[PDB]
Design a protein around this ligand. Structure first.
Ligand SMILES: CC(=O)N[C@@H]1[C@@H](O[C@@H]2O[C@H](CO)[C@H](O)[C@H](O[C@H]3O[C@H](CO)[C@H](O)[C@H](O)[C@H]3NC(C)=O)[C@H]2O[C@@H]2O[C@@H](C)[C@@H](O)[C@@H](O)[C@@H]2O)[C@H](O)[C@@H](CO)O[C@H]1O
Length: 587
């Protein structure tokens, strides 16, 4: 084993920071990124506490489809990253980089990345110590004849150099199963056997109309737990709103895939945090997002989605490392072996822990994410673990998994019910994680959670998540319901028929919209109410360390009922929010 170029694990998570090459400006002799970020400017503006955990991911986007274009662009940027000088100290501090080397099956009619050989990649790894890995993304829809063979070579060249091969893929058309050798292409399977410690596998939730969210994330988790990948994560993509044909928030009717650039702006900001929780809460540690202009920002500035949701969330997972592989293994009661493609794909979990076929969210944390691996793999390395002796390893073809009812009946006997209410909740140590699981329906949800004898009832509007931690002197609360008003994008359309016929915003139009109406002159959403009720309280709680998104919240209201030893907390907000409540329990 060659020394790893960086650590990626629960204590050292990874936020990938995408920069998409501007192919049009490249033809004009310029080296630039769509959205106006610059390599140096972007890096400098990453907060210093995040710098150790963030890596610039170059993507060749629409660079010309011919030999030399991607190499030329990439070498230019690697040179800039390598020569970076910290202006605060004057020292040369090379910027860590990942190169996107494979995408869209590397078809010469799809991507300039086709003309990046393994020899060139080896050469860059040897020249640039700051090149930490290479990235393959989104070939599920164009599964090239040699994709597994190429993947094997990418992992091996990364291992050779101590870097990481990162592959983001969704289980559309059995992609994850094929990658590990389902259809007899076994080169990557053999590669993984030798080099799994340099592999990161992520979901890519883009193709949302196919509903493979739950099954792909299950695989990513199970691959990790069974030592087929070093760590896992997900790429969470606001393009899901386009794929599923949604338009104005909560509006009725479906417009299909007809208004791409309005659509990828519309996903509520806080909902990305809800998606990211499914990674964190299940031991995943790698995070990436599209569309980059909305999810990260433009012109070296943070978008509000980034500043108020993603940055906060990522800081959270650094401060509170995700459950270790050992811990997840200890908590795992069922591990599935077999192919979800032969059991309805995403339908497998519908009305088990997901509320519909097309959603990136869960409706209960009761089973958290049930881990699985494709039928083609073996559970040998899983069973070798000191931490796996209490796991039921089951074939997906078992009668326990044959229908929706059978799955719930079997899982319920092994995963006890641990809260009440129709709402998402999952518990980790002294922390309750809660979210409203509605995607595009304006319906409040409620739940009742317990910290031993202390009862906490919550009421949440859609696109709201909370983390509630029982601390020695009370309760720490982190809340996030940040959702700006996107209606202006859908103005002039009173129904789906008219919405579908709006003039295209276009890629350039959307980037301009972000600059003019999101980075500034933002149409913030209305403050909305969250209720928290605590029962079993001695005296009126006191509030401490209250902060949140600037100008986004009213002072929380506490109403203590002495006779019933209970407090009703009413919050009116739209943003991120944090405080502590200090109290003693009534005994
Ligand atoms: C769901 C799916 O499989 N779609 C295929 C395309 O892949 C992605 O799909 C998106 C629509 O859901 C969208 O077209 C993505 O590209 C736009 O957004 C990115 C940033 O998010 C860039 O700005 C792209 O330039 C832009 N494309 C256009 C035409 O303006 C697309 O994601 C991109 O392409 C894939 C292959 C991968 O490289 C991603 O990392 C990258 O962001 C796919 O591109 C399309 C091509 O014909 O086919 C769809 O079936």
């Amino acid at each position: 084993e060659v020394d790893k170029r960086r650590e990626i694990n629960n204590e050292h998570p990874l936020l990938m920071m995408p920069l998409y090459a501007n192919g049009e400006e490249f033809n004009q002799g310029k080296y630039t990124f769509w959205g106006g970020d610059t390599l140096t400017g972007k890096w400098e503006n990453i907060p210093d506490d995040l710098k150790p955990y963030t890596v610039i991911q170059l993507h060749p986007d629409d660079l010309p489809k011919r030999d030399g274009a991607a190499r030329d662009f990439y070498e230019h940027m690697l040179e800039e990253a390598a020569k970076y000088v910290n202006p605060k100290t004057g020292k040369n501090e090379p910027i860590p980089v990942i190169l996107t080397v494979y995408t869209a099956g590397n078809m010469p009619y799809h991507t300039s990345a086709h003309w990046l050989s393994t020899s060139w990649i080896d050469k860059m790894y040897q020249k640039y110590p700051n090149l930490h890995g290479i990235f393959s993304t989104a070939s599920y829809w164009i599964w090239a004849n040699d994709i597994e063979n190429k993947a094997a070579d990418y992992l091996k060249v990364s291992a050779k150099n101590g870097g990481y091969f990162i592959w983001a893929e969704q289980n559309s058309g059995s992609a994850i199963e094929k990658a590990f050798g389902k259809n007899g292409k076994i080169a990557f399977q053999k590669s993984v056997d030798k080099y799994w410690k340099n592999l990161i596998f992520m979901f890519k939730n883009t193709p949302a109309a196919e509903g493979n969210d739950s099954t792909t994330e299950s695989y990513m988790k199970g691959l990790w737990l069974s030592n087929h990948t070093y760590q896992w994560g997900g790429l969470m993509d606001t393009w899901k709103w386009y794929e599923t044909g949604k338009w104005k928030l909560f509006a009725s009717g479906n417009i299909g895939k007809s208004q791409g650039d309005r659509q990828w702006l519309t996903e509520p900001e806080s909902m990305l945090g809800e998606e990211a929780l499914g990674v964190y809460l299940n031991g995943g540690v790698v995070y990436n997002f599209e569309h980059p202009a909305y999810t990260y920002g433009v012109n070296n500035k943070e978008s509000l989605l980034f500043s108020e949701v993603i940055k906060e969330f990522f800081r959270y997972v650094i401060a509170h490392p995700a459950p270790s592989k050992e811990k997840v293994l200890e908590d795992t009661k069922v591990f599935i072996h077999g192919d979800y493609s032969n059991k309805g794909n995403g339908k497998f979990f519908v009305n088990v822990n997901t509320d519909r076929e097309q959603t990136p969210l869960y409706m209960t944390g009761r089973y958290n994410v049930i881990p699985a691996i494709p039928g083609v793999l073996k559970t040998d390395k899983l069973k070798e673990s000191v931490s796996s002796s209490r796991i039921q390893i089951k074939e997906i073809t078992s009668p326990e998994f044959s229908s929706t009812q059978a799955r719930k009946e079997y899982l319920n006997k092994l995963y006890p019910m641990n809260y009440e209410g129709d709402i998402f909740a999952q518990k980790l140590d002294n922390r309750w994680f809660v979210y409203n699981y509605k995607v595009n329906e304006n319906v409040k949800q409620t739940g009742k959670l317990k910290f031993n004898s202390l009862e906490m009832n919550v009421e949440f509007e859609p696109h709201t998540y909370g983390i509630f931690e029982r601390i020695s002197n009370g309760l720490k609360v982190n809340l996030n319901n940040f959702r700006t008003n996107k209606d202006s994008l859908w103005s002039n359309a009173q129904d789906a028929n008219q919405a579908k016929k709006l003039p295209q915003l276009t890629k350039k139009g959307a980037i301009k919209w972000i600059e003019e109406h999101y980075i500034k002159d933002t149409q913030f959403g209305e403050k909305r109410v969250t209720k928290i009720v605590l029962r079993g309280i001695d005296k009126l709680p006191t509030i401490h360390s209250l902060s949140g998104t600037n100008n986004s919240y009213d002072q929380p209201s506490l109403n203590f009922d002495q006779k019933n030893h209970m407090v009703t907390i009413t919050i009116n907000s739209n943003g991120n929010l944090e405080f502590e409540l200090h109290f003693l329990e009534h005994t």
